[PDB]
Design a protein that fits this description.
The structure is cut from a larger assembly and holds chains A and B. Chain A has 16 helices and 27 strands. The relative contact order of chain A is 0.11. In chain B, strands 1, 2, 3, 4 and 5 form a 5-stranded antiparallel β-sheet that branches. A 5-stranded mixed barrel of chain B has the order 6-7-8-10-9. The radius of gyration of chain B is 22 Å and the shape is elongated. Classes of the chains: A alpha+beta, B mainly beta. Chains A and B meet through strand 16 of A and loops of B. The structure holds 7N-methyl-8-hydroguanosine-5'-triphosphate and S-adenosylmethionine. Chain A binds one RNA strand through loops. Chain B: It is found in: Nucleus.
Chain lengths: 695, 171
RNA sequence: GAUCAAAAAGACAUACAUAAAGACCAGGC
């Protein structure tokens, strides 16, 4: 084998795609006989249906030449012989992250910036939308680190992998906020085994993923499944066949319409593996088989890459689910599922077949040259790839990856990190107390439409996230120390929030159970994205998505993070309908005022914050002729029905201008409260004032 | 139980403290040395109420320190066996709930919990809920316990309580 | 498929605790 007739190593990669599948998506009646059960075949030498016999025998022979070689001698020759080996993981936890960095460049950012069929981005970082993704068989989540690092918090990841030495090392995400990721191990959630091949893990994960994606599914799935086949490397395809099927079935289970899929595979000689690729070609707008230069040249590792999940894939999903049940029934028997599509159907698509053969034979030819090159670099130890450092620098430049070492974050103290995150904003802005709402200050809530309101359940605090459980709170006074938060919860680094701590009582009296929860009032920085200058509702839109991003529903032992329910001030009437007199554990049987949330939980309210969302000289009126709200500039006298950019109240104006209507003793806000103090504003006084000033 | 008593102390002043602010330093030295401490004789010294009298300083022979006897009024906490006090179960440990009576910790053995209060690990926040449910007995709840015994290990006192009598438990 | 560590200056690791007691004998000022 002349390996010296190889093309000069390059950072420029070419993609060949399958043609566009012109056949309809197979239905339950068409697929009804496609599942052929035969004898368990553990022979790869005669799998010539989609590759020339001479090339198949040549690549198998070139693999088996290493069976007599010391693994450390092979590994050292391979490290000298591979032009791309100096890329490694760069600053990421492993070299798998760099495969996703490479492929997300080669595929036009379709994973990190997915598009509709009109080429428009499906996720905009300024709008309330998150990039949902999934990562399966993916421990320790190197692929996930690149995606989370690339999109910061504007992404939410869902993970499933086998429990054990190869579980998710979320602690080792030095470049990404691990709080934006949620591992789920199938049946039982956090306590499951994570077996992708097992159907129950697939089902529980499937329901969980759809629920955590507004019942739409993820924008894309990544799948990097593989296990050790030490001393059986030639049988890697046949051994991994059920894992390949379960990753493809997972794509059809949780990827949204128009979504994308990427899966690791090995060899694709068997009619079983080719029939699985044919089903993906039916189910997606475009499919390709691709080996990135970050994959080692001498191994069978390649990726199937699928773009645009079609509508009507349900029958193919439910077929592959039945085939997985059949494979599980045939475990440890002399029988196996040998076909999932008939050979006559696959070979009837000549355009699919001509791509499949050409993809296999091209891969075999390159793998044979790369195996012969490693063998020569074992025999002669003076051989080296001189361009490895040049090629590395060009690949990192091309893919937009900074050339920096993996450094454990740095440990910043919460005070120094707060000064970094505020970027020279005056610290005194964080010390401002709310104006109390009283009969003397009631006029300040004019004009009513400029305001939002929310029910408070504790004193307001600042909260900083330094990563994982390194969460600290501060009470806004320059004299006060940052205090470590004693709650079982996790937050991405570079997070700065305005919060309160609210205990959520469940039930009443002796049976009552109260759980404290983090309640976000407003947001400044979300995983290194500054949002302080965005409109209060717009900042809250980013805040609401963030709570889901850091959510952990498989972990009922964790303390919840929530966003406060924000009301329009002209709709404060809707708050009092959620006030109830409940028997709290320890109140000697005396009912206490309780605000009931969106779930079956309540807290004791302390009062109501009133926050200005419109900046001076602007204010919001209501046009009686147009039946629409409008912005009015008090200085220029201009009027518009669109939001002026200079009318936006940033965080510092919202925080400084805030009022607080305290709900202590003598204040009537629910009809069961007696007696009322005449010097204190009731619900009726505040609602009457609001009604007079709506018009 | 909380008490208001008269206590004494000897303040040993390092020679640097002398000079102008001498009497003031004694009071500040006193506040720092007794507040937060605990003893078996009087228990936890919660705070110094008033300083009645400052004794004339006597040079101690052979050492720099000069000792000022000090009479002061303080608030102390000294528990007794059989007394009922309201406690919060900081830790619902399976072996027993850990209840902090003010500044003093108190352990209620599981064996001293009525048999109707089964321990429930599977509940979201762990708790010894009553078998049907009825009383969760979890974190932040207010309970009534009877101190069965006290101990003092390294100036710190801790107690053991029981829930066997009637009208004890959840509040 | 992912990953693939070298034994951290030893301080009688410290009281040099060999220094039996007990006795008689010799000498010193
Ligand atoms: P990966 O495990 O699929 O492949 P990798 O990138 O790690 O490279 P490597 O295993 O070292 O070798 C590349 C290909 O050769 C096969 N091997 C490895 N190996 C130790 C071995 C192989 N084949 C035979 N017949 N005998 C052997 O002792 C790997 O599986 C890769 O395909
Ligand atoms: C080498 S990893 C891929 C790397 C990963 N993409 C990353 O970037 O870190 C392959 C993973 O597949 C997992 N795996 C293999 N079989 C599995 C199964 N039946 N169910 C779930 N995970 C499986 C393995 O545990 C392994 O962690």
């Amino acid at each position: 084998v002349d390996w010296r007739d190889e093309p000069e190593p390059s950072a420029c990669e070419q993609v060949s795609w399958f043609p566009e599948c012109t056949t309809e998506i197979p239905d339950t009646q068409e697929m009804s006989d496609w599942m052929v059960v035969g004898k368990r075949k553990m022979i790869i030498e005669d799998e010539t249906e989609f590759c020339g016999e001479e090339l198949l025998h040549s690549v198998l022979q070139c693999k088996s030449v290493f069976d007599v070689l010391d693994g450390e001698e092979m590994r050292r020759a391979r490290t000298r012989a591979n032009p791309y080996e100096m890329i490694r993981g760069v600053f990421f936890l492993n070299r798998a992250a760099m495969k996703m960095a490479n492929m997300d460049f080669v595929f036009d950012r379709m994973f990190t910036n997915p598009r509709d069929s009109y080429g428009k981005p499906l996720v905009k970082d300024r709008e309330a939308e998150l990039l949902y993704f999934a990562d399966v068989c993916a421990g320790p989540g190197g692929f996930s680190e690149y995606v989370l690092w690339r999109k910061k918090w504007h992404a939410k990841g869902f993970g499933m992998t086998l429990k054990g030495p190869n579980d998710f090392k979320l602690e080792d995400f030095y470049s990404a906020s691990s709080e934006l990721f949620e591992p789920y191990y199938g049946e039982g959630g956090i306590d499951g085994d994570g077996d992708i091949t097992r159907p129950e893990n697939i089902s529980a994960f499937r329901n969980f993923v759809l629920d955590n994606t507004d019942r739409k599914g993820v924008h894309f799935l990544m799948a990097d499944g593989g296990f050790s086949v030490e001393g059986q490397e030639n049988l890697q395809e046949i051994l991994s066949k059920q894992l390949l099927l379960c990753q493809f079935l997972m794509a059809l289970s949780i990827v949204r319409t128009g979504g994308h899929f990427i899966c690791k595979t090995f060899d694709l000689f068997t009619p079983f593996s080719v029939g699985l690729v044919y089903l993906l070609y039916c189910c997606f707008e475009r499919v390709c088989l691709f080996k990135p230069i970050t994959s080692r040249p001498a191994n069978s590792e390649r990726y199937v890459v699928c773009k645009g999940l079609k509508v009507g894939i349900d029958d193919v999903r439910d077929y592959l689910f039945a085939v997985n049940i059949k494979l599980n029934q045939l475990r440890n028997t002399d029988s196996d599922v040998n076909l999932v599509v008939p050979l006559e159907v696959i070979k009837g698509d000549h355009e699919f077949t001509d791509y499949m053969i050409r993809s296999n034979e091209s891969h075999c030819s390159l793998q044979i040259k790369a195996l012969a090159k490693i063998h020569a670099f074992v025999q002669d130890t003076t051989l080296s790839e001189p361009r490895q450092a040049e090629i590395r620098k060009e690949c990192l430049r091309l893919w937009g990856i900074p050339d920096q070492a993996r450094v454990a974050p740095s440990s910043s103290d919460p005070k120094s990190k707060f000064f970094e995150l505020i970027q020279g904003t005056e610290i005194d802005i964080f010390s401002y107390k709310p104006t109390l709402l009283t009969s003397k200050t009631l006029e300040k809530i004019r004009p009513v439409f400029d305001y939002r309101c929310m029910v408070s359940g504790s004193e307001q605090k600042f909260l900083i996230g330094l990563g994982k459980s390194q969460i600290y709170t501060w009470d806004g006074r320059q004299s006060d120390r940052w205090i470590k938060l004693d709650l079982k919860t996790e937050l991405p680094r570079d997070t700065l929030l305005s919060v309160e701590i609210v205990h959520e009582l469940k039930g009443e009296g002796k049976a009552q159970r109260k759980i404290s929860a983090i309640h976000i009032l407003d947001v400044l920085v979300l995983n290194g994205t500054d949002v302080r200058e965005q409109h209060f509702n717009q900042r809250i839109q980013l805040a609401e998505k963030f709570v889901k991003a850091v959510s952990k529903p498989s972990r009922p032992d964790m303390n919840p993070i929530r966003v406060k329910e924000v009301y329009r001030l002209e709709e404060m009437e809707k708050i009092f309908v959620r006030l109830e007199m409940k028997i709290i554990k320890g109140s000697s049987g005396t009912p206490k005022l309780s605000y009931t949330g969106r779930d079956d939980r309540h807290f004791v309210p302390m009062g109501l914050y009133i926050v200005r969302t419109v900046n001076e000289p602007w204010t919001m009126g209501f046009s009686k002729s147009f039946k629409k709200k409008f912005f009015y500039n008090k200085k220029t006298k201009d009027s518009t029905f669109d939001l002026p950019a200079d009318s936006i109240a940033p965080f510092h104006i919202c925080y400084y201008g805030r009022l607080f209507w305290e709900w202590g003793d003598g204040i009537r806000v629910h009809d069961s409260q007696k007696p009322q103090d005449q010097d204190k504003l009731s619900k009726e006084d505040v609602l009457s004032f609001i009604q007079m000033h709506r018009a | 139980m909380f008490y208001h008593i008269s206590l004494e102390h000897e303040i040993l002043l390092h020679p640097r403290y002398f000079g102008p602010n001498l009497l003031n330093t004694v009071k500040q030295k006193l506040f720092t040395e007794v507040e937060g401490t605990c003893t078996g004789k009087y228990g936890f010294v919660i705070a110094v109420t008033t300083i009645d009298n400052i004794g004339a300083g006597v040079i101690q022979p052979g050492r720099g320190f000069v000792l000022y006897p000090v009479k002061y009024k303080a608030i102390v906490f000294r528990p007794f066996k059989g007394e009922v006090v309201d406690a919060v179960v900081t830790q619902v440990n399976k072996v027993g709930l850990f209840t902090e009576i003010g500044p003093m910790s108190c352990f209620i053995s599981r064996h001293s919990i009525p048999s109707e209060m089964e321990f429930d690990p599977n509940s979201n926040p762990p708790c010894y809920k009553t078998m049907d449910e009825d009383i969760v007995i979890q974190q932040d709840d207010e309970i009534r316990l009877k101190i069965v015994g006290t101990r003092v290990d390294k100036n710190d006192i801790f107690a053991i309580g029981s829930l066997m009598d009637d009208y004890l438990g959840l509040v």
